[PDB]
Amino acid sequence: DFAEYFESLGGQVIETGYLVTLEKGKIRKAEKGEKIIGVISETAGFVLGESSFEWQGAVLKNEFGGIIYEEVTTEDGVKFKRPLPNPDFDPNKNYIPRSQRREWHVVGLLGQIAVRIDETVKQGHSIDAVGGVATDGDNFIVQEITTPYTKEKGYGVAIVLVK
Amino acid sequence: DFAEYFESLGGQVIETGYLVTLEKGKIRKAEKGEKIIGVISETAGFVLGESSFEWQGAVLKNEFGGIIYEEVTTEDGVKFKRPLPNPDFDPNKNYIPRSQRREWHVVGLLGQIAVRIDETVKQGHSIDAVGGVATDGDNFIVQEITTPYTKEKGYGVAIVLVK
Amino acid sequence: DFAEYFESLGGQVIETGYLVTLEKGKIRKAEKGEKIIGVISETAGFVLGESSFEWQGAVLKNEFGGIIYEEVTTEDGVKFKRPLPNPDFDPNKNYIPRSQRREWHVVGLLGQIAVRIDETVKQGHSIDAVGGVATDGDNFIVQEITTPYTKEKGYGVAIVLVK
Ligand SMILES: Nc1ncnc2c1ncn2[C@@H]1O[C@H](COP(=O)(O)OP(=O)(O)OP(=O)(O)O)[C@@H](O)[C@H]1O
Ligand SMILES: Nc1ncnc2c1ncn2[C@@H]1O[C@H](COP(=O)(O)OP(=O)(O)OP(=O)(O)O)[C@@H](O)[C@H]1O
Ligand SMILES: Nc1ncnc2c1ncn2[C@@H]1O[C@H](COP(=O)(O)OP(=O)(O)OP(=O)(O)O)[C@@H](O)[C@H]1O
Ligand SMILES: [Mg+2]
Ligand SMILES: [Mg+2]
Numbered sequence: 001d002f003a004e005y006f007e008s009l010g011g012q013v014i015e016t017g018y019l020v021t022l023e024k025g026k027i028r029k030a031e032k033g034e035k036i037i038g039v040i041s042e043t044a045g046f047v048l049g050e051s052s053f054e055w056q057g058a059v060l061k062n063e064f065g066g067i068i069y070e071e072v073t074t075e076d077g078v079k080f081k082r083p084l085p086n087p088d089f090d091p092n093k094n095y096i097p098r099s100q101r102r103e104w105h106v107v108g109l110l111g112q113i114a115v116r117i118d119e120t121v122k123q124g125h126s127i128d129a130v131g132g133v134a135t136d137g138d139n140f141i142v143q144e145i146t147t148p149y150t151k152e153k154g155y156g157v158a159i160v161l162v163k
Numbered sequence: 164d165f166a167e168y169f170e171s172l173g174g175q176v177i178e179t180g181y182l183v184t185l186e187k188g189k190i191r192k193a194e195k196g197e198k199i200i201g202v203i204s205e206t207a208g209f210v211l212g213e214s215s216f217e218w219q220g221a222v223l224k225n226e227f228g229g230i231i232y233e234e235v236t237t238e239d240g241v242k243f244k245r246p247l248p249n250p251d252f253d254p255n256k257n258y259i260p261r262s263q264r265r266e267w268h269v270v271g272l273l274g275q276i277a278v279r280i281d282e283t284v285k286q287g288h289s290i291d292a293v294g295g296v297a298t299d300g301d302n303f304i305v306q307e308i309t310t311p312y313t314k315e316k317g318y319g320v321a322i323v324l325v326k
Numbered sequence: 327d328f329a330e331y332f333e334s335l336g337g338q339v340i341e342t343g344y345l346v347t348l349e350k351g352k353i354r355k356a357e358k359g360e361k362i363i364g365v366i367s368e369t370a371g372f373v374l375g376e377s378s379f380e381w382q383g384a385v386l387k388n389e390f391g392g393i394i395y396e397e398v399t400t401e402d403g404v405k406f407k408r409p410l411p412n413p414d415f416d417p418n419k420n421y422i423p424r425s426q427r428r429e430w431h432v433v434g435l436l437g438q439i440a441v442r443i444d445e446t447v448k449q450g451h452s453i454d455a456v457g458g459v460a461t462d463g464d465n466f467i468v469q470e471i472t473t474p475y476t477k478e479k480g481y482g483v484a485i486v487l488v489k
C-alpha cells in the first residue's frame with residue numbers, strides 16, 4: 001500500500017490490521033460512524049514521514065513545512081540555496097529514527113491492505129469499524145477474506161482495497 | 164499515476180484505458196452502478212505488488228502479509244532478525260516476474276490517468292462506466308479529452324483525475 | 327504527501343498551501359461547492375509528472391500516454407523493443423525541467439498536507455474552500471492547526487489529511 005507515518009494518541013501501540021482514525025491530531029482505533037483514514041500496515045512499499053536519517057528539525061522549515069533556503073552570494077554573485085539549520089539543533093543529542101520509536105505507526109492510506117475482520121465481513125462487500133476491527137458496512141471494498149473469522153481468535157483477516 | 168498490481172478475473176487480458184472493478188477478489192471491466200477502483204495503466208511511476216525479483220512466497224509472511232522474521236542469538240547474544248523461508252519454496256523452479264504474466268495488470272488508483280471514453284464524456288465533467296468504457300456520470304473529474312470519440316473507433320481517450 | 331505535477335490555468339503562480347481545483351484541464355484556486363483535487367505542496371516525497379531529464383515528447387507515445395516501442399529483429403531474430411523518437415524532436419533545442427518553469431505546480435493529492443486556513447477552521451473538523459483558502463466544511467479531516475489564524479496575516483496554517 002501507499003502509507004504515511006502517524007503518531008498514536010496516547011503514545012500507545014496499535015498492532016497491524018486495525019483500522020484507525022484521528023483525534024486531536026493523532027491516531028487511535030476506529031469506532032462506528034467515525035471516519036477511517038487508514039490501517040496500520042507492514043506491507044507498505046512507499047511511506048512518507050520517516051525521518052530516518054536526521055532529526056526532523058535539523059533544518060528550519062517555513063509555515064508550510066517546506067525547507068527554508070538561504071540565498072548565498074559569491075564571486076560577483078553566483079547564487080545558490082542552502083538549508084537553514086535550527087537554533088535548537090543539537091549534534092550532542094543522538095538521533096533515533098521513527099521506525100524505532102513506538103508512538104510512530106506506518107498507516108496505509110491507499111491500496112490493498114490486510115485488515116482485522118469479524119464474523120460479519122463478506123467478500124465484495126463494504127466495511128465499517130468498531131474496536132478498530134472491521135465489520136460489514138459502507139466503506140472500501142473487501143477483496144478477499146484470507147484468514148476466516150473465529151470466535152476463539154476474536155478476529156479474521158481480509159484484504160480490503162482502501163482508497 | 165500511483166498504481167497497484169491486480170489479477171484479472173478470468174485470467175483475461177484487459178487492455179489499457181478501461182475502467183475496472185472487483186469481483187471475487189479480481190478485476191474485470193466496470194459496468195454501471197458498480198464501483199470503479201481504477202484504470203489499467205501504462206503511465207504508472209509508482210506501482211505496488213510487482214514481485215520482480217523473487218517468487219512472492221520465497222519468504223513466509225504472517226496473517227497480515229508482513230515478513231515473519233526469526234530472532235537469532237549469537238555471542239552471548241547479539242540479536243538480529245532474518246527472514247523465514249517457505250517450506251514450499253523451490254530453487255529448482257524458475258521464476259517469471261509479474262510484469263510478464265498475463266493475468267497481472269497495472270491498475271492506476273490515483274492521479275491523471277488516460278481513459279477510454281464514449282460520445283457522452285465532456286471536459287470538467289464526472290464519469291461512470293459501461294463495458295469498462297467511460298460515460299458521463301458521477302465519478303472523478305475529466306481533465307481533458309485528448310483523442311475525441313469516433314463511432315468508427317468505438318471510443319475516445321480522456322485524461323481523468325482518478326482519486 | 328503523494329503529489330502530481332499540474333499546469334495552472336492562466337500560467338499563473340499559485341503559492342503553496344492554497345487548495346486547488348480544475349477548470350478546462352488546468353488548476354486554479356478553489357471556491358465553494360467546487361471539487362478540491364489537492365493542495366500546492368512543498369512537502370511531497372513522491373511526485374509524478376516531472377520530466378526532468380528530457381522533453382516529455384522526446385519519445386512518441388500511444389493514445390494512452392504509454393511509450394510506443396518498435397520491435398527490432400536481428401540475427402535470425404533476437405527481438406527487443408526500443409523507444410520511437412518524435413518527428414518534432416529537436417536536439418538543437420535546450421531543455422528546461424518542469425521544476426523550473428512557473429506554470430507547473432506540485433499538487434499534493436494524498437496525505438498530510440499543510441493548508442491555508444481562516445478563522446472558521448477547527449481541529450478534528452472537515453473543510454471547504456473559498457479564495458483557495460480553507461474554511462469549515464465537508465471535506466478531509468483537519469489534523470492540527472499549526473499557525474493560528476490572524477486577521478493581520480489574513481490566514482493560518484493547518485495540517486489537513488487529504489485523501
Ligand atoms: N533539539 C534536538 N536536536 C537534535 N536531535 C533531537 C532534538 N530533539 C530531539 N532530537 C532527536 O529525536 C529523538 C527523540 O526526540 P523526538 O524525536 O520525540 O522529538 P521530535 O522533534 O518530536 O521528533 P518526532 O516528531 O520524530 O518525535 C532522539 O533520537 C533525538 O536524537
Ligand atoms: N513453490 C514455488 N517455489 C518457487 N517458485 C514458484 C513456486 N510456485 C510458483 N513459483 C513461481 O511463480 C511462477 C508461476 O507461478 P505463479 O507465480 O502463478 O504462483 P503464485 O504463487 O500465485 O504467484 P503470483 O501470485 O505472482 O501469480 C513461476 O515463475 C515460478 O517460478
Ligand atoms: N520540439 C521540441 N524538441 C525538444 N525540446 C522541446 C521541444 N519543444 C519544447 N521543448 C522543450 O520544452 C521547454 C519549453 O517548451 P515546453 O516545455 O513548454 O513544451 P511542452 O511540450 O508543452 O512541455 P511541458 O508540457 O513540459 O510544458 C524547453 O526546455 C525546450 O527544451
Ligand atoms: Mg514527537
Ligand atoms: Mg497467482
Ligand SMILES: [Mg+2]
Pocket residue numbers: none
Ligand atoms: Mg506545456
